[PDB]
Amino acid sequence: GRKLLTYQVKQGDTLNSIAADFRISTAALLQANPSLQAGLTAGQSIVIPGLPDPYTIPYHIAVSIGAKTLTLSLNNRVMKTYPIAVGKILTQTPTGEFYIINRQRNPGGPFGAYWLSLSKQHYGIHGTNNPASIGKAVSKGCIRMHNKDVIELASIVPNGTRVTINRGS
Amino acid sequence: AXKX
Amino acid sequence: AXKX
Amino acid sequence: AXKX
Amino acid sequence: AXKX
Amino acid sequence: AXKX
Amino acid sequence: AXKX
Numbered sequence A: 001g002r003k004l005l006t007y008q009v010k011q012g013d014t015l016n017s018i019a020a021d022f023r024i025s026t027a028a029l030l031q032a033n034p035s036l037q038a039g040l041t042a043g044q045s046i047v048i049p050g051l052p053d054p055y056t057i058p059y060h061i062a063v064s065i066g067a068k069t070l071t072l073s074l075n076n077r078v079m080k081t082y083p084i085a086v087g088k089i090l091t092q093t094p095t096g097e098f099y100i101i102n103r104q105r106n107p108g109g110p111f112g113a114y115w116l117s118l119s120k121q122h123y124g125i126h127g128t129n130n131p132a133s134i135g136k137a138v139s140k141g142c143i144r145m146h147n148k149d150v151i152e153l154a155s156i157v158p159n160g161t162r163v164t165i166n167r168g169s
Numbered sequence B, C, D, E, F, G: 001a002x003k004x
Helices: A015-021 A026-032 A147-156
Strands: A004-008 A045-052 A059-064 A069-074 A077-083 A097-099 A102-105 A114-117 A162-166
Touching: A015 A026, A026 A045, A069 A147, A077 A147, A114 A147
Parallel strands: A059 A162
Antiparallel strands: A004 A045, A059 A069, A069 A077, A097 A162, A102 A114
């Protein structure tokens, strides 16, 4: 048995945009889900080739927008809580149920050592070159954490990890 | 959306 | 967010 | 659905 | 998933 | 334009 | 998660 990730799509999201945002092959999407080439079925759980099952992952990331913090829960038990930075785009999602699609290791630039690609380019998590910008709200930036925090997270959590971006209010 |  |  |  |  |  |  090969337990893979399952993403739920809606009606309006362009297939090309989905493949691009997910950084995956468009052909692979049609490979796992041959119905996509015909039409976008809203409410259907599509299979993402290369992504593991998000329930098998014994790590739950509970993001709190109003508290600007990331609650890392191991086996449904809170293990650590680190301060994070969120943008106006993060306040949009009330539930924010997203999964990690891939993780970039050492981009060379001021990305913060590591880059965690989520199911949305503006809802992704990464470090930074200025830790003073962490813990507060930013204009239109993505989820930012400390250099050590993202390193710790990338070591504890794998791929497909369920990040729940809750506003808290 | 986007990225960094 | 986008008629039908 | 998703549990064991 | 699913040849098998 | 955004490899990895 | 989340029921419609």
